[PDB]
Nucleic acid binder design. Structure first.
Lengths: 271, 94, 46
RNA sequence: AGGACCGAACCGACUAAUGAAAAAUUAGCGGAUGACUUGUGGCUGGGGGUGAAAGGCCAAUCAAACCGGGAGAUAGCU
RNA sequence: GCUCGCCGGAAGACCAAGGGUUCCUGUCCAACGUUAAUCGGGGCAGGGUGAGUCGACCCCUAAGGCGAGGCCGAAAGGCGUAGUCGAUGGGAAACAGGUUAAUAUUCCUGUACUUGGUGUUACUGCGAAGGGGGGACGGAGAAGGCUAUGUUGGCCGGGCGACGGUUGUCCCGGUUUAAGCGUGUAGGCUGGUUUUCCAGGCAAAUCCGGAAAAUCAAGGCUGAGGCGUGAUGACGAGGCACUACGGUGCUGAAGCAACAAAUGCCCUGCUUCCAGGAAAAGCCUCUAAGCAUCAGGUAACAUCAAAUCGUACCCCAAACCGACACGGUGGUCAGGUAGAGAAUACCAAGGCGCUUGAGAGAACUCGGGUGAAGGAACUAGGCAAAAUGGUGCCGUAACUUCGGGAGAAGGCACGCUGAUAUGUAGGUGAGGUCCCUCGCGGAUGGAGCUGAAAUCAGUCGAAGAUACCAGCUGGCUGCAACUGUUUAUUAAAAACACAGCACUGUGCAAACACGAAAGUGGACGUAUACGGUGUGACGCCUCCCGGUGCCGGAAGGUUAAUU
């Protein structure tokens, strides 16, 4: 649930927590963990390639299963867990054969729930099956774009995709953006919405919170000198130019999709 | 097994000093100048063969060379290896 | 006042020492130049 | 509980008067569980870096570092 | 040498880094030392650094570096796989005393430990580049148990006072002892043991994981400290022999108890929070290829082994970074009295008086003290000074986002003595007595020890938070919500940032960015996400598309290479 924190200090006043009690209070499943060091938004050349990334808390990498290939073995959900690497919550499941995996926790899922991958599997939340097997009109998440690859669409805290149509070897998805997109019908997909839907109701409430999430501050181009950004300079507050990136490209409105290889799959762009 | 020839080369001199004398008298320990490359075992071997005397143990150390000045010109003395060799009880050395 | 030079031997060696110089072409060139000049201390190496 | 409060260390540098000091002093002053501070090592290189943005900082050097070279640049000027 | 003064969370002690002989001894005083110098971190000579257990090396890895092939690139070269390097992190082992002019966990004395071989007898499934476990981990908070350490008493040794008193409820000193081995406690974690099966752990697995079934409620792991031993020893106040006045040799009493007590240890624990908290080896275990009655494994016992390099000295500084014998510099140690305290004051241990002195006692300058009457009249401005300043209790407005405002404001009490109470409330807790699955056990018991706070009564002073230490307060108002950041060295702000808001791009080989490219970041993220732009908490809110941009359109006009 969302919880507005009492204003016992400024910087706590405007804080709203999203507190789920059903998460695992404990150390995560250590076999599925692995190291994940921070970039600082800097590439192999050592240059900053993406501004405003830096610091934040140490995090392990939970190895989430997005491919979801244990066909026919029924799994049972052991627990829901906090993943620092994503807006969703993950769920530690236990297959009948003794293997454990992390998956994206879907909306209704909780400890004890049984889930299943495969063509044969029951059309119920958390179950995973090819989109030719999934009924049209259903909400799905963790959608593969290429068969066998692993789920790429609808992974974020409260997302889901609608299967609007199945026309032969393809199905048309209504993506969360509003883009309609053709996808091969043999591509896999998990039933239902992804879990942590009140994630968006959280409000950080102070500068420090942002920092804790590894986000360094962002300086406004207009606050700079002309040598630094296109918006810089001016005595007092001036801004007599069309908005643009730090590299001079228009920012308010100018489209930047150039991919002519996948234009065929996009049925309708978002609006 | 150290070679005879090697052994002969190892041991450079006896070291005369107050401390050395004290060591000799009280602790039955002789203070030698040895080759800088000479390991402890080798030194011990040399002592045993060349002075005919049982060795309890060898402690070594490297003495660093002093920097000196001959007139205006600066110049460093050589480093050299000192060895305290403790002889077994009752071993009297000439 | 914390002055600019704050010595550290390992750091010095890694930065400027012989092996570092050797490692790259430009470093090598520098060494060569030094040699040509007649430098006694070819590198920072003690 | 807290980018909560008072306050030493520690980090800073608002007022003051005053070479030992190429930016310090003494007296007060701000922060002091954090967007804190600090050791060691690492990475980013010059129209390049880095910048909670002052054209700041990049070895007492910065509206384009230093070293060497083109080079005895050119100087209707002194 | 005797006084005096200063530091004492340091101006003391021990290290790292850095330096590199500055250490110690003798000797010399030209230069160096802001003066003199017999002295010196100066000159010259000699001496000095001892390790299986400390550190490096070594084994393991992090960020990152290099990188066979490889991919990419006019050349140079870039990126990167296998790998291999890389500590600031993980990995076996030593303590006490004694000694040098100068080293010591390194020498000596005592008492220990480790992991390797080799050989043994005893046994008999061993075996990895692989599987599993483990190592292995955050912040904050709270205690409880402890010790370091200190205080008092007891004990032991010495003392009987340069001036009134001082054979006592008097004075001074000491009262120390390790690792190791044994015990396995306060306490923490977990249900164990056996059997059966199984699409999992790249193959196999007797291991792990998962299913069942049986049976027993104690099983195991962890763990400070204490106690015992170690120790008939060592050390020991000071006494006693020699004396090159440096010291050397002999000798040696007591060596207990209580209370207080860490920020250290149990604690890598527990509780809790969200921001969700390295890796790999050593270590344990499982098997595969294999070998097969051999090796290898564990078992004690014997023996051999542990090389190499560092070890002086300075290390908040006269030895390092600052041209100087001139501010900066990470870690560890942390006594007493007062105190909340690592603040402050005075002291201990220990270390220093800052390498020019001597006079004088003008103006003026610096740093301080006090000041009649007035009290901001000063001045751009109360700048600077002055003042306020503690604990407890009473009391406290507007306005408010209901948290605040607030330590609002303002007041009262405060010492010492006695009594309450030859020391209370509390804290601690010995004998005795009882129980007992027997121990570091449980009950009862209260000796002794420690010990606030208050009330009443008296009492001294001008003054009792007496020194040091230690808020000035209130009223109206601009700006920025707030904590933060910034021009190293004339600007700390109203500037930047900020949570929040909006627009806009981006469907994943994402947009975008760094790269002739390969590739990398974005992100092991996927539209509740990421980028860019503006605005800047919260509250109430927020006409013009003609111009310039952007978005969409494509009928016509115009329009490149090409032909």
């Amino acid at each position: 649930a969302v919880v507005k924190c009492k204003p016992t200090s400024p910087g706590r006043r405007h804080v709203v927590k999203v507190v789920n009690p059903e998460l695992h209070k404990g150390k995560p499943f250590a076999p599925l963990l692995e190291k994940n060091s921070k970039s600082g938004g800097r590439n192999n050349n050592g240059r900053i390639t993406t501004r405003h990334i830096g610091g934040g808390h140490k995090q392990a990498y939970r190895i989430v299963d997005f491919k979801r290939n244990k066909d026919g073995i029924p799994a049972v959900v052991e627990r829901l867990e906090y993943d620092p690497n994503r807006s969703a919550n993950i769920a530690l499941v236990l297959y009948k054969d003794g293997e454990r995996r992390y998956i994206l926790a879907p909306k209704g899922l909780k400890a004890g729930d049984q889930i299943q991958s495969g063509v044969d599997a029951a059309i119920k939340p958390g179950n995973t099956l090819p989109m030719r097997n999934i009924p049209v009109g259903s909400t799905v998440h963790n959608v593969e774009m290429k068969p066998g690859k692993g789920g790429q669409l609808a992974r974020s805290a409260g997302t889901y995709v609608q299967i609007v149509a199945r026309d032969g070897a393809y199905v048309t998805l209504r993506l969360r953006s509003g883009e309609m997109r053709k996808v091969e019908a043999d591509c896999r997909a998990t039933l239902g919405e992804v879990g942590n839907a009140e994630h968006m109701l959280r409000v950080l409430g102070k500068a420090g919170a942002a920092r804790w999430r590894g986000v360094r501050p962002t300086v406004r181009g207009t606050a700079m000198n002309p040598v630094d950004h296109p918006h810089g300079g001016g005595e007092g507050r001036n801004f007599g130019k069309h908005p643009v990136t730090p590299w001079g490209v228009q920012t308010k409105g100018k489209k930047t999709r150039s991919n002519k290889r996948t234009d065929k799959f996009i049925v309708r762009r978002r609006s | 097994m150290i070679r005879e020839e090697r052994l002969l080369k190892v041991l450079r001199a006896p070291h005369v000093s107050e401390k050395a004398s004290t060591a000799m008298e009280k602790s039955n320990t002789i203070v030698l100048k040895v080759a800088k490359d000479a390991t402890k075992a080798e030194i011990k071997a040399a002592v045993q063969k060349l002075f005919e005397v049982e060795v309890e143990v060898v402690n070594t150390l490297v003495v660093k060379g002093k920097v000196k000045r001959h007139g205006q010109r600066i110049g460093r003395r050589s480093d050299w290896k000192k060895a305290y060799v403790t002889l077994k009880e009752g071993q009297n050395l000439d | 006042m914390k002055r600019t030079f704050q010595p550290s031997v390992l750091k010095r060696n890694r930065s400027h020492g012989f092996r570092a110089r050797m490692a790259t072409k430009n470093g090598r060139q520098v060494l060569a130049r030094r040699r040509a000049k007649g430098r006694a201390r070819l590198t920072v190496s003690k």
